Every structure is written in C-alpha cells, then in structure tokens.
Amino acid sequence: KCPLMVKVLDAVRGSPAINVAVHVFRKAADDTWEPFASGKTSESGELHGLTTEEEFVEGIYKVEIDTKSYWKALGISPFHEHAEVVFTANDSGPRRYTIAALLSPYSYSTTAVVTNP
Amino acid sequence: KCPLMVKVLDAVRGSPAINVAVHVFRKAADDTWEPFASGKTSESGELHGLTTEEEFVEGIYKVEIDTKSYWKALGISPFHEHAEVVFTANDSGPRRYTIAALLSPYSYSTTAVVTNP
Amino acid sequence: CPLMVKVLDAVRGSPAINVAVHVFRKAADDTWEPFASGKTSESGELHGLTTEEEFVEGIYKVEIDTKSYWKALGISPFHEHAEVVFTANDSGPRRYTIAALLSPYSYSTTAVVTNP
Amino acid sequence: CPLMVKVLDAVRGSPAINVAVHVFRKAADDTWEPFASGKTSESGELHGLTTEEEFVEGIYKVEIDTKSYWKALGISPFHEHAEVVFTANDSGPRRYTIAALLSPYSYSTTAVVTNP
C-alpha cells in the first residue's frame, strides 16, 4: 500500500512546501547509499506512492529533502545544503511511516509519526 | 464548511496525540475571552467540526490545548500548564486554518498552515 | 539568574533583538498580576527579571511580543504573541531558562530547568 | 570559537550531556573527510572543535549521535543520528553556533551565524 509518506511545510509563509525534491536511499551491504525512490511534493506539500509494502523491507533508510533549491526559488538565502533524515525500518506488526519536515531558512525540524493501519 | 482544524502530535512516542482537550475562545469587545468551541482530538490527533464559515468571522482567537493532562496520563511530569495559540483571523479571499502542535514534556512547537480551497 | 529568556530568529539565523517580554504571576483572585518586563539584548537574552527572594512558588506567564518583532522587519506574522505558562518553584527554588525560536508562522519554546 | 555545538533534551528539560559529535569536510574528490570530534559537556555544549586558521571555506557535515544518547536513557528512538550540512565561510570568516533540540521521534536544528 503506502508505508512511507513525506510531508513538507514552510514556516515562513504558513503553507505547504510545493515542488520540493525528495530522494530516498537504502543502505546497501557495502555501507553505501543506493537510490530507492524519489519525487517532488504536491500542492499539499505531500509525497505519496514512493514504495509498496513488498519492497519496503527492514533496513536503514535515508530521506533527503532539497531545501536549498526551495528557498532559492523564493529569493531567500538559506543555511543548509539539504535536510537529511536517517532511520531504521523495523517490522513489528504492520507499520506506516510519515516523515514530516518544517522548514525555515536557518532552522528545520523533522518528526516521524508511526502508526498501525 | 471547516475553516478551522487542530492537529496534535506526540514527539516522544511518534504518534498522534489522542483524546487531548482543546478549547477555543474569541476575544469580546470588553477585552475578555468568550468560549467559542471545544472538543477532544480523535485517534488521528485531529479535531474537526469546531465551527463553520458563517460563524467564523474576523477577530482574535485563542486556541488552548490541555497538554498537562495528556502527559500526566502517560506518567510523565511536564513543564507547561497548557499550550496557547493566539491569532487574528482576516478575510482576504477564502481561508482555511490548520493549527498544528508538536508536543514534548519540556518543549512544544506550533505552526499555522493557511490555505485557499 | 532564576529566570532568563532567550529568543532566536529562524529566518535570519540571529538572536532576536529588542523583543519585548512581559511576565505575570497568577494572584489569589485568579487574575494575572504584572511581575516583571524587559527587552532582549543584542545577544537575544533577557536577564535581571527577578531575584531568588521575589520569585516565589506560583503559576507564571511569560508573554513574548513576536508580532511587533516581525512587523518591524516588514513581515506580517500569524501569531499575536507567544505565551509560556508554567508552575514554578513548587519543589523548592530552581533556575529557569525559557527559550523561543521564532518564524513568521511557527514558533517553538523550550524550558531548561536547573537545580542551583 | 568559530564552530560551537549545543544540544538540549526536550524530554527532561536539560542540556544533553555526553553526546558524541563528529564533524566532516567535503574533500576535492567529493568524499567526507574527518575534521573534528568531541562530546558535549555538562552544559550541553561542545567548544574547541577548530580554529579560525583551520576552518577554511567548504561544505561541512555535523553528525550528532542521538541514538546512543536515547538508548542510554532506555528509550528506543527513531533516528540513527542527526546530520547538519552547510557551506561555511564562503563570504569570509564567520562564527557558527549549531543548536539541536532532541526528542525521541523528533528533532530540530537551528544555526546562529555571527560576523566577528
């Protein structure tokens, strides 16, 4: 179904952060990051359809959010090159992961909401 | 329709914050707060149906979230008595307000997402 | 200092300077009584609000005037102010740092509580 | 100090003590080279990582070992670590404070940038 969803919000304008690039990677045996999935956030600041229950196996994942391009398109010089979220996916009953990020030019926060559907 | 919605998240457990009391007030002419609407967050940490476009007129509003009772039910001693969000509602084209709060025992953050439907 | 306030600006990556802060204490008749007030300095800090002797048990409210701050920068923000409400000194005297991180449509506030 | 890190614990309302921090600089061949490392003190701060002369223009990565921190408190947290990546000193030398506020399933990070 949809075990992984990303949501991005803009704290300066009080809006979804639209057309933000997101790349997802999975840690491979050799300790390097392999591309796993990517997309751009929608009008509601969300990114759905990244993966399926079948492919989303236990492992270490990295979500990379291209925040710098977002701010530059608004004419604001930002501090970070990108925002990175790194976590382990653990089976333990059925799980859905929502990775949220709240963006300002010199600060971001990120939260994980993990629920059972 | 639904011009005002509240969403509450628990940063300690990575979950919606369920059964949290929320009270909404409107500032009256005499500079005091009059009850306006209230409820408890649902299973998804959300509170819908607080008001309608007709009643939600321009004005100063206060959203009060009973965070202290939430933490005490989990057995954690919290710092704040409650979280308060105070803002002006301004007509200027059609607007929907989402007030989000992210809770920890000694810290909270709150964000407003304002969109046009 | 038993009570210190620190304010940061998340848009500019700087301390938030000249921000007005008002502190109140809940009185016997359940009203907010003015307790202390001041403005943040060039480091984003406000010291000297009170003393150990005056800072008795009670419920306190720290009100930060965020709206005037953003307006003076040309930004029309969402919140009227940020309010932090807490019970203080109920297990004996402590030192409190109230920190606030400001953006136009979002803020966060954290408390650091230390035993002298 | 050109580079300082400060870490707070949002669950306990305290500085986050004994947190391991590793700093890297992107080298010519696009790999991360170790630059400096240390542990936060009793005030949640890490000073002395570098000097003005050594801290040249570049892309730096500050990695904070949040997972070990929470595990030692008995809490199984979400993130493996917190990473902050930024270009430094590209318009001349500046002083950087990297602050992080930790909860088990959430963190925030802020930069304060000052011109000496």
Author numbering:
A (entry chain B), B (entry chain B): 9 to 125
C (entry chain A), D (entry chain A): 10 to 125
Sentences from the paper on this structure:
Native human TTR is known to be a homotetramer, or, more precisely, a dimer of dimers. The monomer consists of two four-stranded β-sheets, arranged in a sandwich-like tertiary structure in which β-strands HGAD are opposed to β-strands FEBC.
Two independent neutron datasets were obtained from the same crystal using two different diffractometers at the ILL. Both datasets were recorded at room temperature. One was a quasi-Laue machine dedicated to neutron protein crystallography, and the other was a monochromatic instrument that is typically used for studies in structural chemistry, small proteins, as well as fibre diffraction studies of biological and synthetic polymers. This water molecule mediates an important contact on one side of the dimer–dimer interface.
